[PDB]
């Protein structure tokens, strides 16, 4: 009777996922006859791979990644834009005192294994005249903070200003960073709801029912900021990704601004954003097969 | 002219790679007309993946992985067994007090992101009477120790008894474990030298040149345990994977036993081991395409 839908988040639960949990808790999905199954990823890259393979119909990923994916012939399609601008920043301990991304040359940068991180770091490094081919990336999965703090990596990319940054500071670490948009990286959407082609064609109803629900979750979160932030926190995976309340409210405050759609409903996708993100990548030889903005995303409403 | 050959290590430099750095320092590779360039993986799955694609001609991986890779149609082939038995142990802080792998049900286990670990853990958990679907894997790439020491993970797999075990202990952690061999897993070769089919066909004289120099380095190590281990430590990656004199010589003591072919030459393989490991993976439904032991490995000399 209830349509069961698997939704794989992009990371372990945190402020950015608030709208989804509010949807669950308020029965918005039940009202829509859906049984939403929120799932965490085993590997950071699972979201796009599983969605692509058709194993799961929904997940949260990164716009630049969707393009990378579609460029490799994966049938991944963005059906909604959650965070309309970047969150990703390159981080390191203040003692490192790097002058610019070009100082990463000859050093090792930790990262979650997520591909999107390659074009971002490459652009940032070349933008400063360094030779990215001498920059060493070290996959640390979810252990982003530990890579930098332990010392095994000189810097990290994949960390968010709305999260990892305030957490490290809260934990006492003195963190400095480089903002990708100050080094040739476009204002891409950090996070987008993604599905696969078949499911968009074969199950448009379910997808429409889902977003309608998720949107109510969003609108409710917006009108009930604190209350909704409380919902997430209680639903946090305390065993593997414990959250700090103060850190999370600050995170939410940042995300709210970036999640809101100035000239349309929450989730509305801007064709301009995609077009330039594709050309940015296509320009740096990251796209093996051509990608078109009319195919990288579609409206499920 | 020296024949350039890229060799990707399975992990960062440690006791197990001593025979290779010895063959470089002592000039054995040069003697065989080759210029060997050791490269570290940025991603734990790189070895198998870059070899398969032809991007790299040589690398170190795991016997079960070669099978899985071939099961996925990748053209990789094992050209030498380096560590003839398992090293992989599931590890957790002594606090946990698990009675068996079935206690892992409902918890999260960290792993390097290397596929071979899924079949291992699943077999283990199932042998102890637990539901694996209820076990959560968390990708931490190279940050294995951190996953459990930070409490972010309840247990970890992928860690080696010759390295991580003595390291955690040396760092002050009371570690407990579960040997996969005690829980239905076969005595597979932990480390094996790999190449792709195309290369073994086109560059066999190179491979043979490379392996003689390698055998020579290996034999020197056996006659000069300590001098070799020092060659290794001086050639360690101190910035991203610092080593401890004591743990590393302890590690060598373990590997010396597992690397030696009691009767036969170093690197020698045989259908038996491969067929056993293949059958294991088929029985537990891990293979997609059937795999043939014969095609899975081949002598290099
Ligand atoms: C809180 C947080 N941190 C890092 C990531 C990883 N994204 C790109 O590398 C993510 N999805 N969420
Ligand atoms: C020292 C060490 N630790 C872990 C691994 C990873 N193997 C399987 O996951 C490895 N190749 N070497």
Curated annotation (Swiss-Prot), chains A, B:
Protein's cellular compartments: Cell membrane
Keyword check for Signal: yes
Q: In which pathway does it act?
A: Cofactor biosynthesis; thiamine diphosphate biosynthesis
Which InterPro entries does this entry report, sorted A to Z?
NMT1/THI5, SsuA/THI5
Entry keywords, A to Z: Cell membrane, Lipoprotein, Membrane, Palmitate, Signal, Transport
PROSITE patterns cross-referenced by the UniProt entry: PROKAR_LIPOPROTEIN
One Pfam match, given by its short name, reads NMT1
**Superkingdom, natural source:** Bacteria
- Ligand binding (substrate): 10-11, 62, 117, 160, 164
Q: List the disulfide bonds.
A: none
Bilayer disposition of the protein: Lipid-anchor
Do the record's keywords include Transport? yes
For biological process, the GO terms are: thiamine biosynthetic process; thiamine diphosphate biosynthetic process
Q: Which GO terms describe its cellular component?
A: plasma membrane
**General function of this protein:** Participates in a thiamine pyrimidine salvage pathway as part of the ABC transporter complex ThiXYZ involved in the import of thiamine degradation products. Binds the formylaminopyrimidine N-formyl-4-amino-5-aminomethyl-2-methylpyrimidine (FAMP). Does not bind thiamine.
Tell me how this protein assembles: The complex is likely composed of an ATP-binding protein (ThiZ), a transmembrane protein (ThiX) and a solute-binding protein (ThiY).
Q: Which family does it belong to?
A: Belongs to the NMT1 family.
Name of the protein in its database record: Formylaminopyrimidine-binding protein
Organism whose genome encodes this protein? Halalkalibacterium halodurans (strain ATCC BAA-125 / DSM 18197 / FERM 7344 / JCM 9153 / C-125) (Bacillus halodurans)
